[PDB]
């Protein structure tokens, strides 16, 4: 079935690119890949039309170093159900292996067999398979800071074959990860219902964030209070159940879900979906349309006013089903009638902290079912944000919400739901008139981006640039410096 061009020529793997520097030590696994069609884009296209597969492959490795470096790498094949975590460089020579110097101008070849105890593999129902492992065999001396770039190419062996025809692109587990082609003038903020202004790198005191809107993994798993509508970010609806007099007016509100269903407090969610996930005074518009008809040509009556929702206080308890608003010196809200809130911005920058999570069940309770905190782990990297600027009702300031993902990428990751081949995907930011990349970043499975920078500053880009998915990499991959 396979075209004889495919069987004769090597094509770059989707898990292909890696690095080796003299900051690496012999004993660290630089490359750990698994057998299967995902190592070849033509086979990855043909795999979406069949049910199963069997067969081994052939791997070519290119190294790019000069005549001023020294050292040896080793590439070996490791069978299924063998532990890989405590391999030493002495043990890896007891496998089918190849040892190469870094000064060479010629690529390296290794066959990767398909050792199995059955007739074929299924695309669903995964099972362990053969792997290829690379570690540094002798220490790397770049005498006369020099990072060496490396690529992996594959092609099928003469015994590789596909088994049963299924309808194309229906069966999952064969879908490739794609990233949508949208510019920053077309993306939207995911933690507040405005549009994205620029890209920005994190401050020196921000090393770990935990937000609850705009959290979604690359596999398409919504987390926290993340929903899909832009009109539902920082918005809620329900009925007024209470009234209070103060300097102001208070209007306690029992909230429901945004589809109209009542909110069950025992669900595995921190709060109803789409409530604000930061501390501050959210400014917006509250509105009522009545449920009974006063005469009025057989129509209901309507109210709409300005309101403030403070989320740092003891009465912002959306997990318990309550929220309290405020109208400055206005009393026109009927009790026992439905309300809807539409967010506009903030009132002032008082008690405004964007990286502090509210107490969703109030005081005397702990937040449960929270999305996990994210952070960079590689030495010398920081978080990358998408920054918008918000309106204020009064006072002085220039407030800003940062987000981890654009809302359109959340939507695309939900609709596609492709499997993740590794822990980190390498992306680049392409200038489409020339083809030159501007910077490169890491995109993690949990849904956040890190760059290699020393400053907290806005990122100056052209107007038509976009991100492009290039490869799946591992944790040892060393990004080029952004500045
Ligand atoms: Zn009142």
């Amino acid at each position: 079935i396979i075209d004889p061009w495919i069987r004769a020529n090597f094509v770059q793997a989707p898990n292909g690119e890696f690095t080796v520097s003299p900051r690496n030590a012999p004993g660290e696994v630089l490359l750990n890949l698994e057998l299967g069609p995902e190592l070849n884009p033509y086979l990855a296209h043909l795999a979406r039309m069949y049910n199963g597969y069997a067969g081994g492959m052939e791997v070519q490795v290119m190294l790019a170093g000069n005549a001023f470096t020294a050292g040896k790498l080793v590439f070996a094949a490791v069978p299924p159900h063998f532990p890989v975590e405590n391999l030493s460089p002495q043990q890896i020579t007891m496998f089918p292996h190849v040892i190469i110097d870094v000064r060479t101008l010629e690529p390296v070849l290794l066959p990767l067999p398909d050792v199995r105890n059955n007739f074929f593999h299924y695309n669903q129902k995964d099972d362990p398979k053969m792997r290829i492992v690379a570690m540094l065999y002798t220490p790397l001396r770049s005498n006369g800071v020099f990072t060496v770039s490396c690529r992996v190419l594959t092609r099928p062996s003469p015994d590789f074959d596909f088994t049963y025809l299924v309808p194309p692109t229906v069966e999952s587990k064969t879908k490739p990860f794609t990233l949508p082609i949208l510019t920053l003038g077309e993306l939207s903020n995911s933690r507040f219902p405005v549009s994205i202004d620029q890209m920005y790198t994190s401050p020196n005191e921000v090393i770990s964030v935990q937000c609850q809107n705009g959290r979604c993994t690359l596999d398409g798993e919504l987390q926290g209070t993340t929903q899909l509508q832009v009109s539902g970010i920082c918005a809620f609806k329900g009925e007024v159940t209470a009234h209070l007099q103060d300097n102001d007016h208070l209007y306690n509100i029992t909230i429901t879900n945004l589809n109209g269903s009542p909110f069950d407090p025992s669900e595995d969610i921190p709060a109803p979906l789409g409530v604000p996930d930061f501390q501050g005074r959210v400014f917006g518009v509250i509105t009522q349309r009545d449920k009974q008809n006063a005469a009025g040509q057989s129509q209901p009556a309507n109210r709409g006013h300005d309101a403030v929702v403070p989320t740092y206080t003891a009465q912002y308890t959306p997990k318990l089903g309550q929220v309290q608003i405020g109208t400055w010196q206005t009393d026109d809200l009927k009790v026992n009638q439905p309300v809807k809130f539409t967010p506009v911005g903030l009132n002032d920058t008082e008690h405004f902290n964007q990286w502090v999570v509210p107490r969703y069940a109030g005081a005397l309770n702990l937040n449960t079912n929270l999305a996990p905190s994210v952070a960079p782990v590689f030495p010398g990297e920081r978080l990358l944000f998408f920054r918008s600027y918000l309106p204020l009702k009064g006072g002085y300031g220039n407030p800003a919400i940062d987000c981890l993902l654009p809302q359109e990428w959340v939507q695309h990751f939900y609709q596609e739901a492709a499997p993740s081949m590794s822990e980190v995907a390498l992306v680049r930011y392409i200038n489409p008139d020339t083809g030159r990349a501007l910077f490169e970043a890491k995109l993690h499975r949990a849904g956040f981006m890190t760059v290699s920078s020393n400053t907290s500053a806005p990122v100056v880009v052209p107007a038509n640039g976009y991100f492009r998915f290039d490869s799946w990499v591992n944790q040892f991959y060393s990004l080029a410096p952004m500045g």
Side-chain angles (χ1 to χ4, degrees):
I1 303 301
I2 291 93
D3 192 359
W5 190 80
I6 297 170
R7 293 184 183 272
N9 296 113
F10 292 96
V11 175
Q12 181 179 359
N15 289 284
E17 314 180 11
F18 68 101
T19 58
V20 61
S21 64
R23 292 190 295 270
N24 290 138
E28 295 175 353
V29 173
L30 296 176
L31 183 65
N32 190 358
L33 298 179
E34 188 180 3
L35 183 63
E38 290 84 4
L39 298 176
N40 193 357
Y42 290 104
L43 295 178
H45 186 74
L46 292 173
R48 305 183 71 188
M49 191 176 75
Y50 288 93
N51 195 5
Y53 65 97
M57 293 182 74
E58 179 69 29
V59 178
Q60 191 183 12
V61 177
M62 290 180 184
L63 304 174
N66 58 4
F68 294 156
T69 60
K72 301 289 186 180
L73 290 170
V74 61
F75 294 93
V78 181
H81 294 271
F82 186 79
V84 75
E85 293 180 353
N86 296 116
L87 286 174
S88 65
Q90 184 178 3
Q91 293 178 357
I92 196 169
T93 307
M94 289 185 283
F95 290 111
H97 68 279
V98 60
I99 295 169
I100 194 66
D101 193 356
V102 300
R103 292 183 289 118
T104 186
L105 281 75
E106 295 293 328
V108 183
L109 297 175
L110 183 63
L112 190 65
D114 195 1
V115 174
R116 65 185 184 273
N117 58 1
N118 54 6
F119 290 100
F120 58 91
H121 298 90
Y122 289 104
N123 289 318
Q124 316 295 21
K125 185 62 60 181
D126 195 0
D127 57 354
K129 289 178 285 295
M130 186 68 75
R131 288 182 180 271
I132 186 168
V133 173
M135 63 178 70
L136 186 63
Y137 183 72
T138 61
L140 182 62
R141 278 85 169 90
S142 66
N143 297 114
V145 69
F146 181 74
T147 302
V148 178
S149 296
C150 301
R151 275 89 174 97
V152 177
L153 284 75
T154 62
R155 71 184 180 182
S157 293
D159 60 353
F160 179 90
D161 184 1
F162 285 116
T163 301
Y164 192 108
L165 289 172
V166 295
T169 66
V170 171
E171 184 175 1
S172 68
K173 298 292 180 65
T174 58
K175 204 196 258 266
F177 182 75
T178 61
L179 189 63
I181 305 300
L182 295 175
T183 62
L184 274 70
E186 294 175 353
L187 296 173
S188 293
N189 193 356
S190 65
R191 294 178 66 243
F192 193 78
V194 296
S195 62
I196 290 172
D197 290 330
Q198 64 187 359
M199 291 185 288
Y200 195 80
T201 60
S202 68
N204 289 318
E205 67 271 15
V206 177
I207 62 170
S208 179
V209 299
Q210 184 178 4
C211 64
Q212 301 297 319
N213 288 323
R215 296 293 300 273
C216 181
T217 63
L218 296 178
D219 290 330
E221 181 183 1
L222 271 62
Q223 292 177 354
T225 64
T226 303
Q227 55 87 33
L228 289 172
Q229 292 180 356
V230 177
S231 64
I233 303 169
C234 295
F236 60 92
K237 64 187 288 184
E239 290 187 354
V240 173
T241 60
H243 182 197
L244 305 95
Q245 183 56 327
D246 195 75
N247 178 32
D248 44 336
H249 300 291
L250 298 181
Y251 309 111
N252 297 170
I253 295 168
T254 298
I255 60 171
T256 62
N257 288 317
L258 289 173
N259 59 4
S261 65
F263 179 72
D264 193 0
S266 66
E267 190 178 2
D268 291 330
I269 53 174
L273 296 176
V275 296
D277 59 352
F278 58 92
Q279 299 180 0
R281 299 165 58 80
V282 177
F283 167 66
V285 177
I286 194 69
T287 186
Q288 287 184 353
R289 180 172 292 172
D290 292 334
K291 63 181 73 175
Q292 60 89 28
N293 292 320
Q297 281 276 172
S298 296
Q299 299 295 322
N302 292 320
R303 274 79 57 190
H305 297 287
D306 293 333
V308 63
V309 178
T311 62
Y312 62 91
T313 62
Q315 288 76 239
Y316 180 76
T317 63
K319 178 69 175 177
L320 296 175
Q322 296 298 112
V323 164
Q324 183 172 359
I325 60 171
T327 62
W328 303 267
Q329 305 305 346
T330 296
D331 61 356
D332 199 10
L333 278 76
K334 291 183 181 180
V335 181
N336 289 284
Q337 297 294 324
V339 296
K340 185 178 74 69
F341 184 77
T342 300
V344 177
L346 296 174
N347 296 109
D348 54 354
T349 60
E350 183 66 26
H351 296 91
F352 173 66
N353 293 318
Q354 66 177 355
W355 302 112
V356 179
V357 181
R359 300 290 297 274
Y360 293 110
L364 295 174
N365 289 317
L366 294 176
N367 286 320
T368 61
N369 297 115
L370 295 174
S373 179
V374 300
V377 297
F378 191 81
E381 293 182 353
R382 65 178 63 247
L383 294 172
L384 184 65
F385 297 113
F386 295 93
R387 176 172 286 179
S388 295
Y389 294 104
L390 269 66
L392 287 172
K393 187 178 185 291
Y396 292 96
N398 192 31
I401 295 298
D402 295 329
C403 69
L404 297 175
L405 267 290
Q407 182 66 41
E408 292 84 4
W409 290 3
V410 172
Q411 293 176 357
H412 182 76
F413 294 158
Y414 183 78
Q415 291 293 321
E416 294 294 326
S420 296
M421 294 297 106
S422 178
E423 295 288 324
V424 176
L426 182 64
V427 297
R428 291 182 177 93
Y429 191 81
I430 304 300
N431 191 358
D433 60 356
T434 303
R436 183 184 292 271
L438 298 174
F439 64 97
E440 64 185 5
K442 288 186 177 181
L443 182 62
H444 297 278
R445 288 174 67 97
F448 66 104
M449 297 179 74
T450 62
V451 297
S452 179
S453 178
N454 290 319
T455 61
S456 179
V459 179
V460 176
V461 297
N464 57 3
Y466 61 92
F467 287 101
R468 185 177 68 191
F469 171 70
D470 289 331
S471 177
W472 297 98
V473 298
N474 59 4
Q475 64 180 20
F476 292 105
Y477 187 80
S478 181
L479 293 172
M482 185 178 176

